[PDB]
Symmetry: C3
Subunit: 413 residues, 3 copies
């Protein structure tokens, strides 16, 4: 074929009961620094855009060629001109060669790739704005190598960078080797990571940036992809168990955290399901929980659990009423790292959002949608003490109850 | 349908009689700081670009879906690589849901929207590179709510920002509520603005950035959209009368000036018309005049009037001779604000521009056009004293007569 | 017609035998600072992208209209998000009016243009990542003016900038007048350049940035474009002889070097050919050599010669084995300029690259291709002393033999 334009975009406004700014974000709680995302409904005031320009080509022999570039930007400003704070950057630029006539046996319908990209098989938990796994970087690999016609595999080499790319003394390359295997609804991903002499990176002064940072790592994922709502009702569901050690201890953005100690050990559980309660009510519950030890400091510990619940009630072919409920518990023990103070408590979010759209209201993924909303947030006051440049406890966002209102659009195509 | 690519672009060169750089710009006179634009022909040496990527969709039931992103940049450099000074930024990102089957009564053919955008109904005076009204920002609203089938209305909430978005103590959100009514050729726009605690923004030091800055404002527009040249000849014309007080005292870029005093008061008149003088001559006169008091400083006063006159003489199906005449009078009394000195006097611009094009030469808006030109400018020497980092009076641009030459292209689609 | 999307893109990874970063680039040898490029195969670890968005239009009378914007970026980082170091910028924005009914005689099928662009008639030596001639900037001109129906000419005015565009005292515009003539396989290009008071640019302090810099220049190109492999075998070839003086002494990027002395004198010879050795082997030899005197410092001298040899052996319809051999000799005498020390010696590069593609393997220009590789480099140890912030001799890249491995993709459409 030819050219294709795909993308994602969120844009909107959030204000408090006084008609002034406030804090918002899927990652605003103290637990968010370690990936403890909360519901995103009526809780994202940024204008984020991903523009995907493609050039596809199918040859007569069945062989396909595919080139794609992603140009992204995220702004918190509401103004029509944001040159001074622009974050516009090329996120991806890759080439895929699929269904080559020359590829036989287990490589029959396999697709080869090279360049900078997000792995094709990453998957997320939409309502919480968090990927379950996110393998991205620059490299090469092959998708869909079929063995015995019931076990497909992906093999790849992804490279990343730690530190300042400009400073040759504070810059290191991190390589990731991964095998991704699929057997029915079952998934098993195993990655090996290595960033040589990560521990010897010297900052601009001449001192070691870390010194106790890891140079290697291991990462694994065990996933269950069901075509039903946890096997007891119509719908879908995904449950994943993540584990990592050393550089692999940041279980979501594989190889994206250069500060991890050699003994960093993480376990994360991700799970969500989709199901219709009637021809008008749809429910999408979700859970994210993690336990991370000896992560950045010896003897530290980060533990948290999020529970998000998105509910949509159709009223028209175009009008719906969406509701969201977030609950999160955290017990954080940073051990001085980044001037963080040990904290524990819970966060609550209640959002009511009148929603307009044209597509299937029962489909949590039909996108052109415009929503109006109101949220209420509260949390254990102790949480304010985690950090001083935090959102929780900052000026005007320290009290018990916090109300917010706004409008926003979101789509993808 | 699918994808659409629209945009605008101007690019060219301007040199003086010595083959060296000079000053140029629709806003180069002292009057330009408060919106006093002048002719743009042979007076724009920047390479400005707006790239609009869209994804439209029309459903079988008549309902439309529309997503658009604007990415813009403006460079004064002539070089082929401008990474170091790039201003590439996302100006807009919005979604429009039109002609929904669920919308009845006055909402029949109305279109809902949300995101960052320039309001659909803003209009400009092209030859002077100035909008008449420019409502933009992030928010939501509805277009074309028909009452009694002869009175349409637009209602919206647009949000903007004052100060440095990164500095929480020097950052404020400004909200705007507007109702835009149309009755035949008549238009009446009324907006109310509010940026809470604008007056309490402290700069990076700890001092108040302004202190006497306004926190609220009101803005109004009375417009006449004629389908004839001022009702006495074939063509078109528009005449608008603008008024604003407080934050609304910047009558063009609504809610874009956070330094306005509470008692800031402005009146502005905009008017232009288009008409063919024969099957070869077309004329487009234009006028912009403003009177602003207690704007930035107590007792200040800004008053200016611009008169632009664009004439085109067809010679071929592809060749034309364009002429532009600009006259501007100003009486500015800044009262020490920004080290500006009271000044008064006039500015003159005469431009001759051999133009090449393929479209209708009589249409002032048929765009693909390439022009060669020569301009002469002169002004009251007193004007040079308004500012010291100004264009008028700077090195090599202080004398009476100033000649310029160049080539440029301009289009939109 | 309508919209068109074209572009170019390379993206890959290069690591040494320890799985860590190394130095790479077509211009990494000391000779590279003056244009001494070497083979690029398995020697480019950056993610460079050019995105060309166009809006074409053909009218019923045969007249065409064309608008193009180029947005480019280059990153050495492997990460998925590079906002902090993004180099995204508008490289071009121009308009072409072709085959106008009004244009008769020698201007019959000529095409008029204006804006910022890379000249249509520039050409390169792909395997070495170097243009032969590169005229770019902002201006206007006309292409294909036919005289006696066997002599076509291009005439144009391109403007560029020297110094910081923001600093009015350290900014100068350089203008270039050029006539490009074609008579069969023969080409003769002559350009005159001028940047008034380039020698009087004062840096931020108040001192002269150069003082002995040139204000004018002359450039000439003599080229032979053959439809055979140097007239003795099937294929193609191009041989060009470049000469420049003063500002014209940078013979590739015309008008791009503002530090050239008035007596700067350069001669460059560029030549390459393409030919199939059999139905499976293709060979592309190339040569670039230059002699530049009194360039930046009185009595300085830069002389180098690169010989590149690209060979491809088809094995399948999809698989090929590419080989590259680079040899370069240099004798550099900087005379204290930039703290460079006089150096002389040679550089060697051997690359083996298993390549996958769908297109014509024998065509060096069929692009969708993914390559895996291994390279070996070595050079005279003396070369390490040219500079201290150089690649040769830097930490971990000073020894004799240097091995590298990686994967990359490259395309254009
Ligand atoms: Ca806090
Ligand atoms: Ca002045
Ligand atoms: Ca060196």
């Amino acid at each position: 074929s030819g050219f294709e334009f795909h993308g994602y975009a969120r844009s909107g406004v959030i204000m408090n009961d006084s008609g002034a700014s406030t804090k918002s974000g899927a990652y605003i709680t103290p637990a968010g620094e370690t990936g403890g995302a909360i519901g995103r409904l009526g809780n994202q005031a940024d204008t984020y855009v991903e523009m995907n320009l493609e050039h596809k080509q199918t040859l007569d022999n069945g062989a396909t060629t595919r080139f794609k570039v992603m140009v992204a930007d995220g702004q918190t400003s509401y103004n029509d001109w944001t040159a001074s704070t622009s974050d516009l950057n090329v996120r991806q630029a890759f080439v895929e060669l699929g269904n080559l006539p020359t590829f036989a046996g287990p490589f029959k319908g396999s697709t080869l790739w090279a360049g900078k990209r997000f792995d094709r098989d990453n998957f997320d938990i939409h309502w919480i704005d968090s990927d379950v796994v996110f393998l991205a970087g620059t490299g090469g690999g092959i998708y869909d190598v079929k063995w015995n016609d019931g076990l497909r595999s992906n093999f790849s080499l992804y490279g990343r960078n730690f530190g300042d790319i400009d400073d040759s003394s504070n810059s290191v390359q991190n390589y990731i080797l991964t095998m991704n295997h699929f057997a029915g609804p079952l998934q098993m991903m195993v990655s090996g990571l290595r960033a040589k002499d990560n521990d010897e990176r010297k900052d601009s002064n001449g001192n070691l940036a870390k010194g106790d940072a890891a140079n290697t790592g291991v990462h694994a994922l065990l996933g269950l992809h069901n075509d039903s709502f946890y096997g007891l009702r119509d719908g879908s569901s995904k449950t994943a168990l993540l584990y990592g050690h050393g550089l692999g201890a940041e279980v979501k953005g594989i190889g994206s955290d250069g500060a991890l100690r050699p003994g960093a050990d993480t376990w994360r559980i991700a799970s969500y399901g989709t199901t219709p309660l009637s021809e008008n009510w749809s429910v999408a519950p979700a859970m994210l929980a993690q336990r991370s030890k000896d992560r950045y400091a010896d003897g530290d510990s980060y533990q948290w659990a999020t529970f998000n619940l998105r509910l949509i009630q159709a009223i028209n072919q175009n009008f719906a009423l969406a509701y969201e409920g977030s609950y999160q518990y955290m017990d954080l023990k940073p051990e001085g790292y980044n001037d963080r103070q040990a904290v524990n408590g819970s966060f609550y979010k209640l959002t009511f959002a009148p929603t307009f759209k044209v597509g299937s209201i029962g489909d949590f993924f039909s996108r052109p949608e415009i929503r109006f909303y109101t949220s209420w947030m509260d949390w254990s006051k102790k949480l304010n003490n985690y950090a001083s440049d935090d959102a929780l406890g900052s000026d005007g966002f320290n009290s018990g109850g916090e109300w917010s209102f706004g409008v926003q659009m979101e789509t993808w195509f």
